[PDB]
Design a protein around this ligand. Structure first.
Ligand SMILES: CC1(C)C[C@@H]1C(=O)N/C(=C\CCCCSC[C@H](N)C(=O)O)C(=O)O
Ligand SMILES: CC1(C)C[C@@H]1C(=O)N/C(=C\CCCCSC[C@H](N)C(=O)O)C(=O)O
Ligand SMILES: *[C@@H]1O[C@H](CO)[C@@H](O)[C@H](O)[C@H]1NC(C)=O
Ligand SMILES: *[C@@H]1O[C@H](CO)[C@@H](O)[C@H](O)[C@H]1NC(C)=O
Ligand SMILES: *[C@@H]1O[C@H](CO)[C@@H](O)[C@H](O)[C@H]1NC(C)=O
Ligand SMILES: *[C@@H]1O[C@H](CO)[C@@H](O)[C@H](O)[C@H]1NC(C)=O
Ligand SMILES: [Zn+2]
Ligand SMILES: [Zn+2]
Ligand SMILES: [Zn+2]
Ligand SMILES: [Zn+2]
Lengths: 369, 369
């Protein structure tokens, strides 16, 4: 088709940078992170939405690999598992160097594009990965973390998750607690993209007001099209336009069609809506591949991106608009996050009040007066 | 004084590289790692064995800063606190760049020497810091860990501590378990110095036979002089000689004189013994300043090293011998550990058997149990 051909033509110049793929999670679940297991070979990997040949077929040039540890690891082994997940991403890049180029900056993604490699970054899904520690935060930064999803589907002691909006969770921090605000201040200082997927509206609003840099939704869709609280409402979409932020669209069926069944066209509806309310520069891709049980007809795996782009061209999106959705909006936001960082500025060191630390799996050294 | 002048002349060419200083622990216990606190100013800090002017007076040119988290943090928040202690060391070097040069190699130490800065490295004290994970181990390496003390004063699921030799602990792994052997192999491939301070004799001997590179005792003294199980016995000293390893002398009174009261002359007695049994290239310093309640008369703080060097010269240690004790032996061992590392060798990924993990602060993802 003419649109598919144009899609590929454009994608050769502007490869897609996806904001959220949970392949690392599958590697842990399926092989206990044993990359040498021949069943785990990435050139032939089956049973997942992602593998090397599929990535190449979908013209994927950049990928924020999700370093995710479940909510039940909070106040348990969340920090240990986050390190192991970041480790599996590091090893993956070193194991398939002909394919992946591990990067931690916007300039780095651009170099990957020049080299014909899949720029590979790390996105930490859930603030429970830092265990309310500014020191652990900086450590994750040093290890490659380039975005932090403030919460997953559970509250941290300083940020509220989306389930607060469905009543399944209590509004603990009413957005961001004072420590949570220092976390935003710290993420801003370091140059880490703040990610609002999985958080509550109050947390979305608090962050869009508080952050000194544009923020992202690594894998969130349009609430107007599908009223899932994992999706973004119009008033927030307006804040996204105001701050020049970015919503990277999630392909999960139940967030797209609000039911188990969904198709490629319905994803373009979310894209259209985000483009109309938040603006064309606020649109991106955050498929949630390998993180969801259901993906749309036409978007069975990571090789289907050109078909989604072809559809956007069919709906009259201009080349500039699809190039922005593909990679340029993410790059603009990433560069702004880097410009707004201040590594010379003294790091945030005021800890979270002891009465706010939860669980029965810690000790209280340092805390006294 | 002839020997004090000579000590300084020699120390200006070969400043001391101490193998273990617990200042980070003091920064946590005293200020909860708040380096901006006015009391925490390192140029004026009182109440500790270490601070900037003291380090300069003692001619200290290299230091392995201990990143230590208590034994009771094992199976609790050990990993979290380890990252926080590593973080305070990183921040310390950043806050006083005119004094500390953060380094992670032997060439880096020589660079610090050339610039007149105190080479600042990280020594992780206790295998519980990795919570039996090879991924956390690699993460710590990436964060700057250049030596791992296999155990502190408690057994890990894969190594036995020194208390086993006093009867207070059971010989769980009877040295190193199979996973513990894999840890040692990973430490060798990474280029991390294996530290035998705090381990049982069975662990020292198992590691000495297994390691493919020379090892160290970052802060342990001579068992013949003081029969403390925190000290190294002669048969292990013969293994140290055989492997061209290194024993860095601890200044703690109770490990020196085997009693609360001790003096500089007695520490020199330990150095003499190690030199006799393990050889001159197996001696160094690992004072344990800021990690102990009692230090010898004449060795009150970190500014006292020149007096100890003067005593060794007085005792007829040659210039080559003291330069070895000061810096050259550690540098030799470091270079060997670096040469034994292999970047191309596939990382160890066979996890510890699930049934060997303890505590109630973890989840069993990857295994399923
Ligand atoms: C739990 C896991 C594996 C991270 C991914 C995830 O969160 N998927 C999502 C929806 C799938 C259904 C749960 C989401 O992004 O909300
Ligand atoms: C407990 C703490 C603060 C790490 C340091 C430590 O272990 N010191 C030692 C002896 C002092 C015990 C009193 C040692 O190295 O054995
Ligand atoms: C993956 O498999 C291909 C062939 O199926 C092989 O050529 C390649 O060496 C393998 N890669 C790894 C890392 O095992
Ligand atoms: C499609 O978009 C272009 C902008 O590139 C616009 O000029 C044109 O009118 C649109 N086509 C239709 C049929 O609306
Ligand atoms: C420490 O105090 C001295 C004054 O004694 C001051 O010059 C220096 O800037 C201070 N350093 C920091 C990091 O506060
Ligand atoms: C001191 O050492 C020198 C050279 O190492 C040696 O010749 C001399 O005999 C030693 N002096 C004593 C008193 O042992
Ligand atoms: Zn998610
Ligand atoms: Zn995810
Ligand atoms: Zn110590
Ligand atoms: Zn110690």
């Amino acid at each position: 088709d003419f649109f598919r051909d144009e899609a590929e033509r454009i994608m050769r110049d502007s490869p897609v940078i996806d904001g959220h793929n949970d392949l690392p999670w599958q590697l842990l679940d399926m092989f206990n992170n044993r990359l040498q297991d021949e069943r785990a070979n990435l050139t032939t990997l089956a049973g997942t939405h992602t593998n090397i040949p599929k990535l190449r077929a979908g013209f994927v040039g950049g990928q924020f690999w999700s370093v995710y540890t479940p909510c039940d690891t909070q106040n348990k082994d969340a920090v240990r598992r986050t390190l192991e997940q970041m480790d599996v991403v590091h090893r993956m890049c070193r194991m398939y160097p002909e394919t992946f180029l591990y990067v931690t900056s916007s300039a780095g993604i651009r170099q990957a594009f020049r080299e014909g490699k899949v720029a590979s970054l790390i996105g930490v899904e859930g603030g429970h990965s830092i265990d309310s520690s500014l020191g652990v935060l900086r450590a994750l930064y040093q290890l490659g973390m380039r975005y932090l999803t403030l919460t997953h589907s559970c509250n941290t002691p300083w940020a509220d998750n989306w389930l607060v909006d469905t009543g399944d969770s209590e509004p603990q921090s009413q957005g961001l607690s004072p420590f949570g605000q220092r976390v935003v201040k710290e993420l801003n200082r370091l140059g880490v993209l703040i990610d609002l997927a999985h958080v509550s509206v109050a947390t979305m609003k608090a962050t869009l007001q508080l952050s000194r840099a544009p923020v992202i939704f690594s894998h969130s869709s349009a609430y107007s099209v599908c009223a899932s609280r994992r999706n973004v409402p119009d008033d927030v979409l307006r804040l996204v336009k105001q701050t020049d932020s970015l919503v990277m669209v999630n392909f999960y069926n139940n967030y797209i069609s609000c039911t188990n069944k969904a198709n490629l066209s319905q994803v373009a509806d979310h894209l259209d809506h985000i483009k109309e309310v938040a603006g064309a520069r606020a649109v991106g891709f955050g498929g949630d591949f390998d993180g969801v049980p259901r993906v749309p007809e036409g978007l069975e795996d990571v090789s289907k991106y050109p078909d989604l782009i072809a559809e956007l061209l069919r709906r009259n999106w201009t080349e500039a608009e699809v190039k922005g959705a593909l990679a340029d909006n993410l790059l603009r936001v990433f560069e702004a996050v880097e410009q707004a960082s201040n590594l010379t500025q003294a790091p945030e060191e005021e800890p979270i009040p002891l009465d706010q630390l939860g669980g029965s799996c810690r000790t209280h050294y340092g805390y006294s007066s």
